[PDB]
Amino acid sequence: MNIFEMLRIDEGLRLKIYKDTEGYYTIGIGHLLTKSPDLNAAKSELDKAIGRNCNGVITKDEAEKLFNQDVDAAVRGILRNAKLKPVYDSLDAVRRCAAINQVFQMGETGVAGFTNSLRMLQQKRWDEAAVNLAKSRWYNQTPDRAKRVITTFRTGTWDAYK
Numbered sequence: 241m242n243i244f245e246m247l248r249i250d251e252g253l254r255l256k257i258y259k260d261t262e263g264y265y266t267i268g269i270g271h272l273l274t275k276s277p278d279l280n281a282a283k284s285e286l287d288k289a290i291g292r293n294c295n296g297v298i299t300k301d302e303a304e305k306l307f308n309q310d311v312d313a314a315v316r317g318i319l320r321n322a323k324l325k326p327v328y329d330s331l332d333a334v335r336r337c338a339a340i341n342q343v344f345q346m347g348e349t350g351v352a353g354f355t356n357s358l359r360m361l362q363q364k365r366w367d368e369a370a371v372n373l374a375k376s377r378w379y380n381q382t383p384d385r386a387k388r389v390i391t392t393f394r395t396g397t398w399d400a401y402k
């Protein structure tokens with residue numbers, strides 16, 4: 241297991257524009273195109289991202305390229321965030337993957353709501369952090385995925401992903 245395999249399980253792989261759990265146009269391995277309800281806007285974003293006229297469809301290689309970029313940008317964003325960096329750097333490698341996963345799904349605006357969870361994670365109060373993490377819109381809207389990510393934060397193992 242590694243961050244790519246983990247997010248691949250959580251995000252799936254679809255080669256045509258689809259709507260994510262929030263109803264937003266997405267493609268590939270959880271590559272958000274736009275929050276606009278206009279499919280044409282999503283198609284434009286896709287074409288810009290890939291560098292060709294895709295008409296809403298990409299190849300596996302292209303999906304994996306966006307995924308590489310998106311994971312890289314997620315981790316780099318964490319390091320550039322003054323609130324997230326010290327917590328991330330305090331974590332072991334497996335729990336760092338849980339952090340990347342959460343940021344990938346929710347963005348940094350999303351994880352900003354998690355001050356108390358972050359503090360508990362930095363304190364290595366794992367069971368307490370896990371309880372706090374579940375008291376969230378995130379958990380309630382995507383409970384099976386959040387449970388996996390939370391188990392990863394709780395245990396520092398890959399048990400939830402096999």
Ligand SMILES: c1cc2sccc2s1
Pocket residue numbers: 318324325327328338339340342343351358361
């Ligand atoms: C850096 C650390 C942590 S813990 C949950 C999200 C993030 S980002």
